[PDB]
């Protein structure tokens, strides 16, 4: 089920299998941490012990980009396909948009997650995005942000802070966040906000 | 020819067109800066004025990943391209042409392992030198001099965005290469 790319475990999953695993996570009443490691993240983890530890403690590590798939070719069972973290997020949203799954968007500059919300509502009619908040917050602002996420009863939280900040923030707040899925999505809100 | 994605100019090119442009850059006696902007880079450039300036002064910006292509759907980029595949496809073509390549970046012996693996993958490839990326100021002088003395034409900079673009741009008048391109974690995955 998993392969090791320089200490980083990667779930041997296709896009469809990753979406199915995320849907199954919604049936388990606990926080699930999802990361999408790519070649850049593997490189970063070699120099960042804390990041390497987090990546070894997530519920699902979906491969992102081409580089990580190429690295897996050394194995008898390589990674089955090239997956983009961006496409995984959209495909997962698409499926839950008709199920009433409460989504929270946290990250990017002022009004970017609001614009992303407006655009996702047009793209996926019926999507339930319960709240949004910018990603250039201090540690002081953090507790009020987590309280709003929890008060709105969010089931899925997309964290557009960029790697490794997004994984580190989720992991540090793993016992505070009352969501079922927390997933780092990097620049995904910016490109949907157009 | 170029699309603006939140201030970042993106060359409206397919992978093959990008490879053809890079081949043509080898015929021009000047440094060409190549970046592969993705959604993450676009986001970084909104808060980093110096990075935004560099991305507006590169010779070629090839789209990387799905997010940036999705953003272009407003009016689009012809295809989803990975910067990693662009690097390999460009190496593949120049491996039989004697084009000198320098590998700079990544931890300890990763760049040298990447060199060994590229020599197996593309027989005839001319990688004249390698160096790790966690270098000091005194080491930069030695690296730049090695790059120029060995006569490298193509430089792959595996330092990660924005460090890779910033390092190339700061040293744009020191580097005697025809192409300098940031490649992120590309050496690690070839090693």
Residue numbers in the entry:
A (entry chain A): 3 to 196
B (entry chain E): 3 to 77, 80 to 195
Paper passage:
Selenomethionine (SeMet)-labeled TagAΔC in its apo-form crystallized in the P21 space group as a dimer, with eight molecules per asymmetric unit. The subunits in the dimer are related by two-fold non-crystallographic symmetry and possess similar atomic structures; their heavy atom coordinates can be superimposed with an RMSD of 0.11 Å. Each protomer consists of eight β–strands and nine α-helices that form two distinct regions. The N-terminal region of TagA is formed by helices H2 to H4 that pack against a β-hairpin constructed from strands β1 and β2, while its larger C-terminal region is comprised of a six-stranded parallel β-sheet (β–strands β4, β3, β8, β7, β5, and β6) that is surrounded by seven helices (helices H1, H3, and H5 to H9). The arrangement of the six parallel strands forming the β–sheet resembles a Rossmann fold commonly found in nucleotide-binding proteins. In the dimer, the C-terminal helix H8 in one subunit packs against helices H2 and H4 located in the N-terminal region of the adjacent protomer, burying 1,212 Å2 of solvent accessible surface area to produce a narrow pore (detailed in S6 Fig). Analytical ultracentrifugation (AUC) experiments indicate that TagAΔC dimerizes in solution with relatively weak affinity, with a monomer-dimer dissociation constant (Kd) of only 7.4 ± 0.7 μM. Consistent with the native and SeMet-labeled proteins adopting similar quaternary structures, introduction of V43E and A72R mutations into TagAΔC disrupts dimerization. The C-terminal appendage is presumably unstructured in dimeric forms of the enzyme, as, importantly, the contact surface used to engage the appendage is occluded by inter-subunit interactions in the crystal structures of TagAΔC.
